[PDB]
Design a protein around this nucleic acid. Structure first.
Length: 109
DNA sequence: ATATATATATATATATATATATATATATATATATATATATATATATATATATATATATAT
């Protein structure tokens, strides 16, 4: 669904950006939950409360863990991106949709 | 020119996944009400003594 696609695109670009610096296959840096909500806000707005957005992000991460793309949030609310994200079927789709929605919001604002 | 057997296109129906709302089961807390227990006071009945109304026995 749309939200899962956006989250996967964000995670994918984070992973590629990290690999650009530390090299291919470098141990992924732990990313906090607080860091992703501002970014999902860029494409989904504010659903009404922090208690709602954080819950949505957590359920999305748990859904993605089923496919193996991300680990479970650790005791301090940080996740790690799994290697399997690099081998998605068509990574070009993520870039296109993500940039398209970003351009949409930039045009409407 | 009609039947009779493939092939292709299209539509329908089903399965999977997720989001949202509702129902059910269970547990707990609360409030209310009922019933009971307790305490107190008063009423009734009986017993005993004295007072009022009436009559009889004993001693000389």
């Amino acid at each position: 669904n749309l939200e899962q696609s956006l989250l996967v695109a964000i995670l994918r670009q984070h992973f590629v950006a990290w690999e650009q610096e530390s090299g291919t296959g470098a141990s992924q840096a732990q990313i906090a939950i607080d860091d992703l909500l501002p970014q999902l806000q860029i494409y989904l707005g504010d659903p009404g409360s922090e208690s709602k957005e954080r819950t949505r992000l957590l359920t999305l991460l748990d859904q993605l863990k089923g496919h193996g793309l991300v680990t479970s949030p650790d005791a301090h609310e940080r996740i790690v991106i799994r290697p399997i994200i690099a081998h998605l079927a068509d990574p070009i789709n993520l870039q296109a949709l993500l940039a398209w929605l970003r351009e949409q919001i930039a045009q409407q604002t």
